[PDB]
Amino acid sequence: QFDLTVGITDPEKIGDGMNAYVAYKVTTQTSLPLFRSKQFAVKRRFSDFLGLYEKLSEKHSQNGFIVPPPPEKSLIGMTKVKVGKEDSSSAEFLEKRRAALERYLQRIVNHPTMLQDPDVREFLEKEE
């Protein structure tokens, strides 16, 4: 793919006291002579990562990959979402979104042309 293998796992609480937010454990690893070096893990909020998942579709409306989710229809993507924005049904549900986040992330990180946006190319490592 691109010698880059990141795995998003569980959503831990960052803030505390009134309004706490969850981070994203993106342990990307690419020994290639591009960036990262020695691989590692970065912590960022969903509101930030969303910029990709959201922008990804912004590229078009019908033609040109009209599926924000993983490279292709992997159930989680499009099937019976019905709703639009976030809703969350249970605590574990929050983790379900994390997993898919890596699936879609792999595609963008996979192809340098896919990301396109200078931010997306550097979003996989976006800290804060």
CA–CA distance from 30 to each of 27, 65, 66, 101, 102 (Å)? 10, 26, 28, 18, 15
Method: NMR
Instruction: For residue 8, give the amino acid letter.
Output: I
- Residues ≥6 apart with Cβ < 8 Å to 111: 2
CATH 3.30.1520.10 fits 1-128, yes or no: yes
- Residue 114, H or E segment: helix 112-115
Separation CA 26–CA 128 (nearest Å): 13
Separation CA 125–CA 122 (nearest Å): 6
Separation CA 106–CA 108 (nearest Å): 6
Where along the chain do its domains lie?
1-128
Q: Is 31 annotated as a binding residue?
A: no
Whether 34 contacts 122, CB under 8 Å: no
Which residue is it, tokens 């959201």?
A: 54
Separation CA 65–CA 56 (nearest Å): 8
Q: Is 13 annotated as a binding residue?
A: no
Separation CA 28–CA 117 (nearest Å): 19
Q: Is 73 annotated as a binding residue?
A: yes
Separation CA 59–CA 72 (nearest Å): 16
